[model samples]
Every structure is written in structure tokens, then in C-alpha cells.
Target: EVETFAFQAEIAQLMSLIINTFYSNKEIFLRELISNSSDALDKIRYESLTDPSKLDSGKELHINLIPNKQDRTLTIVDTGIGMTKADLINNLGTIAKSGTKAFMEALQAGADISMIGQFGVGFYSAYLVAEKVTVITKHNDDEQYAWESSAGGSFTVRTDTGEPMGRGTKVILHLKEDQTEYLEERRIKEIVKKHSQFIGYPITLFVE
Candidate 1:
């Protein structure tokens, strides 16, 4: 069920806006992504409460941040509700206009930046700091899959033959040259504490 698809018109526009408009303060990309991980963990935890056999089962819910200085890559892994093949297409392919406009206006109005993830396009914000992004994920009902894109309006999704994550998602961000500040453990921990400490799950950063 793996395939490649083009992003919806609205999503393409949103990516363009994020790259061009949010380029200056791109550090928030990590915060937004971590917020999303929190949301995914919450979703699975809530579902498991009603159905004991839900996706995560007995796995501990946590977020792991691994930064590789040599590879210029940062990986965020979460033991949470992961996306299926179809979910990836639907979630990343389409961008709701209402949310898009709100994000655009908020950025333009100098509104509270902390609320950026509310617009739902926070995933695309990664492009502000990364040259390419890769996602490896596994859901309870589906086999593992990998999705990769440069945020250039199209992305490729295929079966992932790499190490399994049990039931979760891992996002690898290929840092842009000037965005190397993200590779520092201190900087990442500061941002996580500032924006994601309140999240329900534990967040740990690993640097080598």
C-alpha cells in the first residue's frame, strides 16, 4: 500500500508560507513536533483506557530525542499512536484552509507564538529548519512504513524494513546548515523544558 503522492493545494501553500515566513525563528520546530508527539501519546492512552487491547498495550509512553552531530540529523521518537499508510497520506496530503488562514494571520499579527501548534500545520514547520525529513512509523493494525520528503509538495511512502519501533513513530530531521544549533543537547533540553515540560509523558534527549 506504499505510494507517492502530491500534497493538496492548501498544504503546498502552507509549506511555502512556513518556509518563507517562519525561517527566522525556526527553533520552535522542535517544540511543535514535540507537542504533536504529546498529542499522539494522549490519543493512544485515552483509547487504551476504553479498550485494554489498544495499540500501545503495556508499552511505556515517552518521547526520545536523539541528535547525531556527525550526520547532522535529529530524531524524535515517541511510543504513541502511530499512523497507518492511509493516515500518512491523509494527514500530510491535505491542509485545512481554516487552520491555514489562522496560522498565517497569527504569524502576521505577532500573536502568542506558543499557540502555533493549534493550527495543525506544525508538522510542516520542520521545513523551516531541515533540508529533508524522514518518518518511520508502525501502527498496531499495519506494518511498518517510512515516509520521506523535502517539503517540496510531494512525498514518498514505502514499507520500512528497518528496525521496528513496536508501536510508535520516529521523525528524523536533516538539519539545514545554519540550523546546527539544534544538535546541541543543552539547546534541545532548554527548548523541551520551555515548551514541552508540561506534557503528560517523559521527554529524554540523547546526544553522543
Candidate 2:
């Protein structure tokens, strides 16, 4: 079954802010994504400290960057703490309505804006450069699910039909027309070199 949810008003405004604030800083899309993957990788690492069973999936802990220029899509895959459907609905679906108002205030104060918890303005940053986003994830506790959305009023989550991807999340972005600059491996290497150098996980980029 496919589930559809609408973005709350504040999140809608937050999305707009994320889109506008990064209008010129487009390469940050890759930065934000890899950062998210790094966090997820750490979460599982931390959790497995007490529960080694979580690592039973045996998937290596790493991230993959696959940019398909012909298709105009970039996919970032990570073997990390993927979300359950509930996590998806709660993290992406539920958000405090005042979040964007706080964002505006923070921006006005000239403070460095970063992630806003469950609202994940970082995730919303995907909308900055892509026309659509698709997330396929598998968690230790639950089956895989695929979530997809355009930067529209609503989004959907459906049971993933793809082969049993043992663990982790895949974020696939359909690049905007002029945003194909991201499809270039050299361009990605520069961005990853600049922003992703400190990330501890192995980040691999697929080459032609």
C-alpha cells in the first residue's frame, strides 16, 4: 500500500527557505546528502556497540555516489541506519509547525543555519537542486520502503518492490535541467574533496 502525507505549513515555508538560501550554493546538495549518510553510518555504529545483532545484515558500512549523466540522476547510497516506515512518517511527516518561523528568525540574526532535527531542512535541501527525490531504505527492525516526492504539497511512501536490499538507504535525485553540472564526476570529486574530507566513512563515487 502507498501512503501519502502532506507537508505542514511551517515545513512548506522551510522548504522554500532551503530552496532559496542555497540558490547559488548548489554543490552543497552533495555535501548535505553525504553528511546525512555519515550521520546514519555513525548511528548504526553507535547502536551496534550494545547490540551486535544489528550488524548481522553484514552489509559493509560505506557510501556510494552514482551519477548517471544520461538519465540526469544522482543516487547516494549508504549502508547505514536506514529508517523504518514509522521513522519515515515521524521524521519526515511530523514536524513542529513553528519550525520555519524559527528558521526565519535564525537567518535574520545572521546565525549559521544547520539541520533542524526531525524536520531535516538538510533533507529538504535536496529540493534545491533536484526536481524529484526517491528514498529506498531498509532497517534491521522493518522491511524496506520506498519514499518519493517532488517539491510539492505532498509525498508518498510505498512498500519497495526492489530486490531484498539487506540494509541501509538510497537517496536518488532527478536533477533539475540546468543542474546537470552535478552529473560530472570531476565536479563531484571537487565538492567531496572540499566538504567531505573529514567524513569518516568510505565514500565511493562510480565512474564511467
Candidate 3:
């Protein structure tokens, strides 16, 4: 069953700031994504230590960057701990437990902007360059699903009938007309090297 939910009032405002205020620093979108990917990978790895079977038996831990210039799409795929339906509703549907509200408060107070990720709004940063965002994920405990949005006040989640990802998430960014540069291999490599080189996991690029 597909479900759609509106963003929390505070999240709506945070999305506004991301699209309007942080649009200029659009390159940071990749950084935020890679950071989130690393966090997910770390989470699964940590859990695996306690329960050897926590992860899919043969799935490796890594992140893949697939760029399609023709479609103007850039997908960041990570083999990490994926989110369940409820996780999607809670984490992305609303900002009930998000640090977004606190981040907004600090932003309004003219505080230093170095504290961006503290609010977990990094996922929304994709809107700085993407016209739409699609997230396809599969969790060990949940069926595969896809979450989609256009940075609008609401997003939709539905069961994904495509091939199962086994375990992890794939974030596809449909680049805005003016943001096609992100679909270039050279530009993507530059961004990955500059912002994500030190990431704990291997980052592979797929270009065609």
C-alpha cells in the first residue's frame, strides 16, 4: 500500500531554507549525501558485530555513484541498513524527532552555520539541485519500497516491485535543468574526491 504524508510545519520551513537559502552552496548536497551514506554503513557494520547475520549474508558494504547524463540523473546507492515503512514515516514524513527545528532556531539567531547536519536535514539538501528525488530501499526486516518527492510539502512511499536491493538505499536525484553539471562524470568525481575521499567505505563511480 502506498502512503503519502505532509511534512511537519517545522520541516516545511526547513525545506524552504534548504531550497532558497542553501541553494547557492549546492555542491554541499553531495557531501551531505555521502555523509549520510557513511553513517548508514557504519550503523549496519556496528550491528553486525552483535549479530553476525544482521546483514545480508553476501552483501558487501560500499557506495555506488551512477551518473546518467542523458537522463540528467545521479544515483547514490549504498549497501547499508535500510529503513522500514514506519522508519520512513517517522524519519522522512515528519520532523517530529528531527534536529531541523533546532537548526532553524539557530539559523534565525544568526548562529554559525557549521552546525548543519546536527539537525539531520541533510537528506532534504538534495532539493538544492534536484527537481525531484526518488529513494529505493530494502531493509532486512522490511519489504522493498520507494519514497519520492519534489521537495514539496509532502512525499509518497510505496512498495517497489523492481528487483530487490537486498539491503540498503538508492537515492536518485533528478537534476534540475540548470543543475545538469552534477550529471557529469568529471564534476561528480571532483565533488566525491573533494568531499568524500576520506569516507570509510569505497565509493565507485559508474559512467556511460
* Candidate number achieving the greatest TM-score relative to the actual structure: 3
Candidate 2 segments whose C-alpha is farther than 4 A from its true place? 20-22, 93-99, 111-120
Output the TM-score of candidate 1. Answer: 0.89
* Candidate 1, lDDT over the whole model: 0.82
Cα displacement (Å) at residue 74, model 2: 0.5
Candidate 3: the clashing residue pairs are none
TM-score of each: 0.89, 0.90, 0.92
Which of 1 and 2 is the better model by lDDT? 1
Model with the higher lDDT, candidate 2 or 3: 3
Give the deviation of candidate 3 from the true structure as CA RMSD.
2.0
Off by over 4 Å in 3: 93-98, 111-115
- Against the true structure, candidate 3 has what lDDT? 0.82
**lDDT (Cα, tens digit) per residue for candidate 2, span 123-148:** 77788789899999999899999988
Per-prediction CA RMSD (Å) = 2.3, 2.5, 2.0
